[PDB]
Write a protein that binds this ligand. Structure first.
Ligand code: ATP
Ligand code: ADP
Ligand code: MG
Lengths: 752, 58, 58
């Protein structure tokens, strides 16, 4: 029932916009069965209503080829109603339309640039001659004739707003020419369709603001007053201002904008005077919508605000919203990043009584935003917007708009080198050659920076699953844990249990623990946040734990997000280690981590991965299932894995066929992944002096080989050493053994 | 949740945030049982290690 | 100035010492510079962009 306002049902007056065949600017075609249903006669005049409260008058005719659910009209009427093909309009009879006495029309500047002839005789007289065309004030119609077709705007009619252009009706075109930019602003007016990804939020806002106006008798009979307060909170750039503008534009209300910082005034009494003036102006311009940007800055908590001016501003706002004199027919909307910073009195009923959350756009939501922003642009066949949406993990609608603009600029950069630029005007062939392709979008993606998580920006090491050698089982589990909950939400719903979201990697150094994490950042279509261990700690008393809450809050906002903790042993300890650990601050940080990972809050799609080197010191509460339930041991690579490691490093660099990688793995019993990579580096680095000697020999004769030979490997193995000592190995082996011994019941089988 | 973070035996360290940790416990003590009329407020605490909690709180 | 620039298209508007005419709005002791900044914003939103005129400042 929450989405009851979004739904629509078939009605006789509702008709789908369809292409015209022979219809002019003044007639529309309707099929006979629905004309009988609507009791409409051929030649009758009707009223057509479009989006953003646009009205048009046309003559209804009969067409046997038109569908019962479709109405035929030309492009002129479509532009008049601000509708496109496939839109829904309403048709009703328009009786008592009288013959016009005097109508005033003004041409559009861009349609008359260079036109010096008499507009009346050339265009208006043949267009209206014995045609009895019905017109409405504000209508835009196009007339052919002369050397170029000219558009006109109906600015005045007598009678108004509906009249018939009779033969005795006086038609005059004198007046100030209309400006193209003004018409373009009205054409590009923000409406409900421009908002993407906020269907439920738009539904709530619609029911609160627009529904009371449409059916006031319903509210009078039910005996309640609709809410008069709206509070939209979300990350910056999410589109709260655009939602407010769309609401104020489609509904017949005046949009009045208030900025928090500009209200601030050093003079005593000026700020609340400005607030009063704004409210009185909005009351004068009723219906109106008052929008306040950054309500948190203008109105903080009075008890915590030492400044007198801000406190008096809050009190004035309270009195303006509620007092002895009740404001009527005025809606106040506010946008704030942090809703809890607002004064608690301002959250009361009757004053911002309802709060609506505008969250970070979803994948389909950001795809819809991209579709809306790219509708005016030209798109090639190669480009897929869904790919761009998928690659934009944390981008916001403003970021998407900037991305589209930058990509169009990149197309301009692509075509700039073609033109020699000496001509004042570009030749038409190069003009047509220009187009936007997928490569421009990819370049914009590389250049662009997400704003949801500009604070957590870091270079991408760009590792692939092919880079990692061995660990085939670990690769599959890492891929399944992130992809299954997001790609298959319904599979878990059918089984009715939540997915696991905890992984810990423990093993000897150089075995690929952080290498696996870096591969997750690329392949998965989820946000990735990397935290160095002691990065969160702070000298101040309660700020070490405040950093932990901020990290988990950002991950929850950007869900699905992968939260990777490198060297987890630094922040997680067995607790009660010593009294000198910052006066118990180290113990207190662990407790904050415990609540964030598993507390009394709904579990979002946040996956926590920890890469620890010494796992025995970690708090047992951290390793509990539900926080880090999957403990994966990354050991020293065995003989089979070492071959894969050697092949993985060697695929990029050409090698001689004489080299036997299998023989290297057998001798390299105890080497880790890093130790083998050191042999990889030494082999290529060796004989690099010979490489210069080869090219020097080329210079000598004028006046070493792409494949690395067997000989190069033999010299490199001489310097090879094992970094992980056997004593170190035993420590990890013991911990993994305890896990197997703890479970018991080896080879568990249900009894037959 | 995790009551042991704000509840401590006091005097654990010579310097713990300038004594603010011990001072928070004293404020909690007066709120639960001080010189004020008791209301229908139920305090539930879930602790994982209860041996470090202040004996005055228990 | 802006009207004359629009007339003489293509035109380049250079505003030397932009910080002088339009300093930080909050750090002001007078409404005069505030209204200067506000009117400048209105005219910047008022650019045609079909008359091919743009503004630069140093
Ligand atoms: N299985 C592997 N396949 C390919 N390269 C590997 C593998 N294991 C380690 N390496 C190489 O080791 C180097 C760094 O290893 P990495 O930092 O992932 O180790 P780690 O086990 O996480 O160690 P630590 O905890 O000490 O940082 C890189 O050059 C990487 O290519
Ligand atoms: N849901 C959305 N759909 C389409 N465009 C959006 C959406 N949200 C933001 N935008 C884009 O963001 C830009 C303005 O952002 P704005 O609404 O001013 O941010 P804020 O909400 O912080 O005020 C607009 O150009 C608009 O195209
Ligand atoms: Mg590492």
């Amino acid at each position: 029932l929450s989405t009851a306002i979004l739904k629509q049902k078939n009605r006789p007056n509702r008709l789908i916009v369809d292409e015209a065949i022979n219809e002019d600017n003044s007639v529309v075609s309707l099929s006979q069965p629905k004309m009988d249903e609507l009791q409409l006669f051929r030649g009758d005049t009707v009223l057509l209503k479009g989006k953003k409260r646009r009205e048009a008058v046309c003559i209804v005719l009969s067409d046997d080829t038109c569908s019962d659910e479709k109405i035929r009209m030309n492009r002129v009427v479509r532009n008049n109603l601000r509708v496109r093909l496939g839109d829904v309009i309403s048709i009703q009879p328009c009786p008592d339309v009288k013959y016009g006495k005097r109508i005033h029309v003004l041409p559009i500047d861009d349609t008359v640039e260079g036109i010096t002839g008499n507009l009346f005789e050339v265009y208006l007289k043949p267009y209206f001659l014995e045609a009895y065309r019905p017109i409405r004030k504000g209508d835009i119609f196009l007339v052919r004739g002369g050397m170029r077709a000219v558009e006109f705007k109906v600015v005045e009619t007598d009678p108004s707003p509906y009249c018939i252009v009779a033969p005795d009706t006086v038609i005059h075109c004198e007046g100030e020419p209309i400006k193209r930019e003004d018409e373009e602003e009205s054409l590009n007016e923000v409406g409900y369709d421009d908002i993407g990804g906020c269907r439920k939020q738009l539904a709530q806002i619609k029911e609160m603001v627009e529904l009371p106006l449409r059916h006031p008798a319903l509210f009078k009979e039910i005996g309640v007053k609709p809410p008069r307060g709206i509070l939209l909170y979300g990350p910056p750039g999410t589109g709260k201002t655009l939602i407010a503008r769309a609401v104020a534009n489609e509904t017949g209300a005046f949009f009045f904008l208030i900025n928090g910082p500009e209200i601030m005034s050093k003079l005593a009494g000026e700020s609340e005077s400005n607030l009063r003036k704004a409210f009185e102006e909005a009351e004068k311009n009723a219906p109106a919508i008052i929008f306040i940007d950054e309500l948190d800055a203008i109105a903080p908590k009075r008890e915590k605000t030492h400044g007198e001016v801000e406190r008096r501003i809050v009190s004035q706002l309270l009195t303006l919203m509620d007092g002895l004199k009740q404001r009527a027919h005025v809606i106040v909307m506010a946008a704030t990043n942090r809703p809890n910073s607002i004064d608690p009195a301002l959250r009361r009923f009757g004053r911002f009584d309802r709060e609506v959350d505008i969250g970070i756009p979803d994948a389909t939501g950001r795809l819809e935003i991209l579709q809306i922003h790219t509708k005016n642009m030209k798109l090639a066949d190669d480009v897929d917007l869904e790919q761009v949406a998928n690659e934009t993990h944390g981008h916001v609608g403003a970021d998407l708009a900037a991305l589209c603009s930058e990509a169009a600029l990149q197309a301009i950069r692509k075509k700039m080198d073609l033109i020699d630029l000496e001509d004042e005007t570009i030749d038409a062939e190069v003009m047509n050659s220009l187009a936007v392709t997928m490569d421009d979008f990819r370049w914009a993606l590389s250049q662009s920076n997400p704003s949801a998580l500009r604070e957590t920006v870091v270079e991408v090491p760009q590792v692939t699953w092919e880079d990692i050698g061995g660990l085939e089982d670990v690769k599959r589990e890492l891929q399944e844990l992130v992809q299954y909950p997001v790609e298959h939400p319904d599979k878990f719903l059918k089984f009715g249990m939540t997915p696991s979201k905890g992984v810990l990697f423990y093993g000897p150094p150089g075995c690929g623990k952080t290498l696996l994490a870096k591969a997750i950042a690329n392949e998965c279509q989820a946000n990735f946040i990397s935290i160095k261990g002691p990065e969160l700690l702070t000298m101040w008393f309660g700020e070490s734990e405040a950093n932990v809450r901020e990290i988990f809050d950002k991950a929850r906002q950007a869900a699905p997000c992968v939260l990777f903790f490198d060297q987890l042993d630094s922040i997680a300890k067995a607790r009660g280690g010593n009294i000198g650990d910052g006066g118990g601050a180290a113990d207190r940080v662990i407790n904050q981590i415990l609540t964030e990972m598993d507390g009394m809050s709904t579990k979002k799609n946040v996956f926590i991965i920890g890469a620890t080197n010494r796992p025995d010191i970690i708090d047992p509460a951290i390793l509990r299932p539900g926080r880090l339930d999957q403990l994966i041991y990354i050991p020293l690579p065995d003989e089979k894995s070492r071959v894969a490691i050697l092949k993985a490093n060697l695929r990029k660099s050409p090698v001689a066929k004489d080299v036997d990688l299998e023989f290297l793995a057998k001798m390299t019993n105890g080497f880790s992944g890093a130790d083998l990579t050191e042999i990889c580096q030494r082999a290529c680095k060796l004989a690099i002096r010979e490489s210069i000697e080869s090219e020097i020999r080329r210079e000598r004769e004028r006046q070493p080989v792409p494949e690395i030979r067997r000989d190069h490997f033999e010299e490199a193995m001489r310097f090879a050493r094992r970094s992980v000592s056997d004593n170190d190995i035993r420590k990890y082996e013991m911990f993994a053994q305890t896990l197997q011994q703890s479970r018991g019941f080896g080879s568990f089988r249900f009894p037959s």
